[PDB]
Amino acid sequence: YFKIYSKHTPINLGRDLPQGFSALEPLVDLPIGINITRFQTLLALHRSY
Amino acid sequence: FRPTYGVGHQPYRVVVLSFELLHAPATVCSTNLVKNKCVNFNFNG
Numbered sequence: 882y883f884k885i886y887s888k889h890t891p892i893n894l895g896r897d898l899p900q901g902f903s904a905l906e907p908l909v910d911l912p913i914g915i916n917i918t919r920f921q922t923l924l925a926l927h928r929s930y
Numbered sequence: 931f932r933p934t935y936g937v938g939h940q941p942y943r944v945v946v947l948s949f950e951l952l953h954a955p956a957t958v959c960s961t962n963l964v965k966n967k968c969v970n971f972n973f974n975g
């Protein structure tokens with residue numbers, strides 16, 4: 882089960898990963914068994930700076 | 931595919947069904963409701 886636990890948080894902060902509790906709720910579950918032994922992020926920023 | 935052909939030459943459709951017993955299964959598988967009284971529930975298993 883590839884479970885994706887997602888939670889967006891638009892909170893005020895001067896630096897990333899600030900103080901405060903925000904539980905990660907489950908969003909999408911995938912009932913497909915695949916061997917994920919490696920990982921990369923598809924980052925098609927295009928408009929990047 | 932002629933109508934005059936016999937059973938040996940007549941089209942016999944073949945559609946394969948193969949249920950796979952792999953690791954991740956599918957949901958290939960409901961009463962009504964009561965309001966207030968003692969019953970047995972199988973709500974979602």
Ligand SMILES: *[C@@H]1O[C@H](CO)[C@@H](O)[C@H](O)[C@H]1NC(C)=O
Nearest residue numbers: 882913914915916917953954
């Ligand atoms: C890949 O993942 C599936 C699901 O967890 C598992 O059944 C299978 O054995 C894995 N394959 C191998 C041999 O790594």
